[PDB]
Design a binder for this molecule. Structure first.
Ligand SMILES: Nc1ncnc2c1ncn2[C@@H]1O[C@H](COP(=O)(O)OP(=O)(O)OP(=O)(O)O)[C@@H](O)[C@H]1O
Lengths: 37, 209, 280, 327, 126
């Protein structure tokens, strides 16, 4: 089961870390107005 | 000061009164955690003075023992639930010398855990009738009593007490008792040792220690 | 000053003011510190903490009453302030003294029940009843020390007026009866029950443990401190009052005045050290 | 073939979060003060949950009591006696008419609050798990996702009382779970120093994240659902991205040698609130990995910590039997 | 990914000597207490050795003292079990184990049936 799961999860559509960081930054910048903490 | 608000505060007051009534009986009872191996025969001590919950009363004081066994063999996470128990009961198969090393390591890991370092442990060396007839560790040659069955029983007790006194000072204590298979007085033992434990906490909070 | 014998109380103005001043300053200092810990950096409010808080309050009130008395003693037995201030000062002095005694008694009884009865005393809830016990103690001490306001007056003898501690003349029999009753009720019973409680506590602790002998050492220390501070004070005060009620020599009265006035600083020192012994 | 996965994760790594967010204005020193102290529980608080209405919260304690508080007025709406004093999880239904719990009894007990002229009673008991119940979260009034210490998670049907699907591929006891905002996925962190993303409909594991070093204790989804955080026993919080399939941040500082018990995000996701076993709580800059505040008001151990749905407050329960609302 | 890989497993006569070395990876070596875990044909999971994070506290099973001296290298991320006095009653599989938490010598769950931070093991036959 472990090798089958590894083979299943090895074929994924992974994107660049820069894009994920930019998306997180965009969300936190866009929603910073409505965070009362 | 509305009617609905006043009813809410009244209901909260009734709930708090019930909570105080429950607090009266919660502190007057003592929780005991039962630990040991599969062959330890801890259920024998359970049925003599009676997740399995065992409730018994000695000197009008209510004791409630918990033998949790519906779990896996990885207990580093759920053992944190038994943090405010009055005592931990350890039951040891003293007559099966093959597993005394694992029992000793189990007691050692209980002793040095950060979440159990303030909880005292009552020790029951259960299978003593089998130990007497029956009679690994190389220290039995040079060991001297502080027949041979007395040497063996006190040597196992001394191994447990050496592990206990190696690291536990001033916060929790070990209470070794020599249990038999048909003992009918372990309720008195648990009562007296919990009494000593609460006396020690009392002396700590009375600024005398 | 209708007295035939004249006391050579030249020792007082040198002994009593400095002792009262030092006791008051330390007492206020460490009692304020302990109250600060209790009200700011502590949320373990047991029965012991309740009794200790009330004891600290009584000690602080005693140390607050002391400055007027050191002023009076340094003024050469002259009280030019008022006639009600003298009554209030004596009333607060004795009220705080006996409140401290009764709260030490409450601490001793609590500790005795906790040690002799570790498990059965958990059955009945007594941590919340500590506030009721403390309030009853305060009410009882105030009610018992109310006649001090009547008895203590301000009278002028020569070129100076005096803050009477005992009573006015021609009323000494009533106050000696009242003081015998008060001495009985607020010292003979509390000291005896403190003695019994700590003796029984030590006894058991001594019946087997480094902790179970350190606790006995602490018991001996606190019991000896209470005895040394309070027993000679009350014994000499009773002897002084009885011999003034009777008729004796001037030298004997001077000697008992010596002893009473030198045992007063120990009574103040009890409030001085109580915080260090019971918290630190 | 784990080396191939590591190489593929390395190939997509071109901008570290510490570098791509190095020119962002730091937040101020977050100073939050206690507003309410909830003082009705007898023993240590084990868990808490917030109602969707952002006013009512449920909590669990060692004394086997389930108290529903009114955070605005500090008044206890309910006080439910449990059959077992050993619980570790609380769940408040989104509709607010049900409350669940569980623990060493291995049973998720469900209590109906909106009864007809009757007190709160056990509506159902889900008894198919093997290990101790660690976490449970209502999907709706009829579905609840549960994790336990038998290295499995399960989705239940409350009306019938048996599991619908089981999420079995995991090692070590699953300690926490976090529902996605879309309620179509959930992540679970276990004691094998790994976290897995599950599909509720498919019942299969889609991703695995193995950055941590010890037992993962808490897990929380990012507000947009594209990331999550994990607090573990290695005294370190880390941030993982579902799309990048790799760790992005490591909220670790020296002189912190205690495990993280609770993890929560703010409404915007800028603040990561983490409870610790060193008596206190920390506020983390999620995209800068730098400290921003401390909630030092508890006395024994911060066991639970949650941020309100509208984000107006953070409630932190502790082992000192007190809950605290912060703002 | 916490990975522990061992080596040094081969058939040895009742005499002779052997050495085992586990190559730790994926975690900080010097913050954790580590141990040695033994198996055998048809029995459970045993416990042989123990060493602290600093290396100043060593504990042995009662049947291995004076024969199975251990070592660790925080710089090289390795932990050893030098076997010198072998007996035929030593055929085993040896796993290099680790405490679950740092600064924590609990190792509560080290010898469990399933343990995440344990190595695959090398068969030491005699
Ligand atoms: N029988 C007496 N003979 C001589 N002097 C007395 C006598 N009784 C009282 N005095 C004097 O009267 C003063 C105060 O009388 P009182 O008894 O009320 O106070 P006290 O208890 O003696 O001690 P203190 O005066 O310091 O308060 C004392 O200074 C004392 O010298």
């Amino acid at each position: 089961k472990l090798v089958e799961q590894l083979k299943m999860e090895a074929n994924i559509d992974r994107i660049k870390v820069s894009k994920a960081a930019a998306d997180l930054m965009a969300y936190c910048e866009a929603h910073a107005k409505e965070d009362p903490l | 000061l509305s009617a609905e608000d006043k009813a809410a505060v009244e209901r909260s007051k009734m709930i708090e009164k019930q909570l105080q009534k429950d607090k009266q009986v919660y502190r007057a009872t003592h929780r005991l955690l039962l630990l040991g191996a599969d062959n330890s025969g801890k259920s024998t001590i359970v049925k003599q003075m009676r997740i399995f919950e065992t409730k018994f009363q000695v000197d009008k004081v209510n004791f409630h023992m918990f033998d949790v066994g519906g779990q896996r063999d990885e207990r580093r996470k759920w053992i944190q639930c038994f943090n405010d128990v009055t005592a931990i009961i350890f039951v040891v198969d003293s007559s099966d010398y093959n597993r005394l090393q694992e029992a000793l390591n189990d007691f050692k890991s209980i002793w040095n855990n950060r979440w159990l370092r303030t909880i005292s442990v009552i020790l029951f060396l259960n299978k003593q009738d089998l130990l007497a007839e029956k009679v690994y560790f190389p220290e039995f040659a040079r060991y001297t009593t502080p027949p041979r069955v007395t040497r063996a029983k006190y040597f196992i007790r001394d191994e447990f007490l050496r592990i206990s006194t190696a690291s536990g000072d001033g916060r929790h204590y070990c209470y070794p008792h020599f249990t038999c298979a048909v003992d009918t007085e372990n309720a008195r033992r648990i009562f007296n040792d919990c009494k000593d434990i609460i006396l020690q906490m009392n002396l700590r909070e009375y600024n005398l220690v | 000053l209708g007295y035939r014998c004249r006391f050579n109380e030249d020792f007082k103005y040198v002994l009593l003011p400095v002792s009262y001043g030092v006791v008051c300053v330390l007492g206020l200092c460490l009692n304020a510190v302990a109250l600060y810990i209790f009200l700011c950096r502590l949320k373990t409010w047991n029965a012991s903490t309740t009794y200790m808080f009330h004891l600290a309050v009584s000690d602080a009130l005693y140390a607050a009453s002391l400055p007027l008395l050191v002023y009076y003693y340094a003024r050469g037995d002259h009280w030019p302030f008022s006639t009600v201030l003298c009554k209030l000062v004596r009333f607060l002095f004795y009220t705080n003294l006996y409140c401290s005694i009764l709260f030490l008694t409450c601490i001793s009884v609590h500790r005795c029940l906790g040690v002799l009865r570790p498990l059965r005393s958990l059955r009945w809830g007594r941590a919340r009843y500590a506030r009721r016990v403390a309030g009853a103690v305060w009410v009882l001490v105030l009610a018992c020390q109310a006649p001090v306001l009547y008895f203590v007056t301000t009278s002028a003898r020569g070129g100076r007026v005096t803050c009477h501690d005992t009573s006015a003349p021609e009323l000494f029999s009533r106050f000696v009866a009242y003081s015998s009753v008060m001495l009985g009720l607020l010292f003979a019973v509390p000291f005896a029950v403190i003695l019994v409680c700590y003796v029984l506590m030590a006894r058991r602790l001594l019946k087997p443990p480094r902790a179970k002998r350190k606790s006995v050492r602490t018991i001996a220390v606190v019991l000896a401190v209470f005895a040394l501070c309070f027993l000679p004070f009350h014994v000499t005060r009773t002897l002084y009052y009885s011999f003034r009620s009777l008729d004796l020599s001037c030298h004997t009265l001077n000697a008992i005045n010596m002893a009473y006035k030198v045992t007063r600083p120990l009574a103040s020192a009890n409030s001085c050290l109580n915080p260090v012994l019971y918290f630190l | 073939l784990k080396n191939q996965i590591r190489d593929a994760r390395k190939a997509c790594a071109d901008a570290t979060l510490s570098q791509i967010t190095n020119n962002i204005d730091p937040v101020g020193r977050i100073q939050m003060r206690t507003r309410r102290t909830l003082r009705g529980h007898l023993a240590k608080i084990y868990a808490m949950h917030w109602g969707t209405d952002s006013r009512l919260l449920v909590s669990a304690s060692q004394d086997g009591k389930l108290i529903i508080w009114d955070s605005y007025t500090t008044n206890k709406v309910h006080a439910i006696p449990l059959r077992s004093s050993w619980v570790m999880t609380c769940a408040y239904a989104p509709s607010g008419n049900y409350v669940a719990c569980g623990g060493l009894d291995n049973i998720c007990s469900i209590y109906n609050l909106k009864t007809r002229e009757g007190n709160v009673r056990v509506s159902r008991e889900l008894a198919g798990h093997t290990g101790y119940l660690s976490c449970c979260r209502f999907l709706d009034d009829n579905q609840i996702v549960t994790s336990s210490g038998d290295t499995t998670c399960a989705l239940w049907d409350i009306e019938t009382g048996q599991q619908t699907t089981t999420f079995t591929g995991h090692t070590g006891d699953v300690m926490s779970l976090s529902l996605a905002p879309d309620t179509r996925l959930f992540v679970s962190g276990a004691c094998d120093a790994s976290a897995k993303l599950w599909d509720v409909r498919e019942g299969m594991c889609r991703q695995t994240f193995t950055g941590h070093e010890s037992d993962i204790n808490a897990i929380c989804f990012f507000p947009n659902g594209n990331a999550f955080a994990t607090g573990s026993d290695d005294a370190t919080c880390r941030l993982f991205d579902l799309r990048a399939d790799q760790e992005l941040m490591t909220y670790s500082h020296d002189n912190i040698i205690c495990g993280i018990t609770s993890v929560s995000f703010s409404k915007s996701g800028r603040l990561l609130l983490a409870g610790y076993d060193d008596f206190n709580c920390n506020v983390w800059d999620a995209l800068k990995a730098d400290r921003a505040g401390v909630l030092a008001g508890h006395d024994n151990r911060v066991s639970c910590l949650g941020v309100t749905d509208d984000g107006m407050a953070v409630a932190t329960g502790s082992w000192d039997s007190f809950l605290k609302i912060w703002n | 990914q916490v990975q522990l890989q061992e080596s040094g497993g081969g058939l040895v006569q009742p005499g002779g000597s052997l050495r085992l070395s586990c190559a730790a990876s994926g975690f900080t070596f010097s913050n954790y207490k580590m141990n040695w875990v033994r198996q055998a044909p048809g029995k459970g999971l045993e416990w042989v050795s123990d060493i602290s994070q600093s290396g100043a506290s060593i504990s042995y099973t009662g049947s291995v003292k004076g024969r199975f001296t251990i070592s660790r290298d925080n710089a090289k991320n390795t932990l050893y079990l030098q076997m010198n006095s072998l007996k035929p009653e030593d055929t085993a599989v040896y796993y290099c184990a680790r405490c679950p938490a740092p600064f924590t010598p609990f190792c509560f769950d080290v010898t469990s049936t399933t343990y995440a931070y344990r190595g695959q093991g090398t068969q030491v036959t005699v």
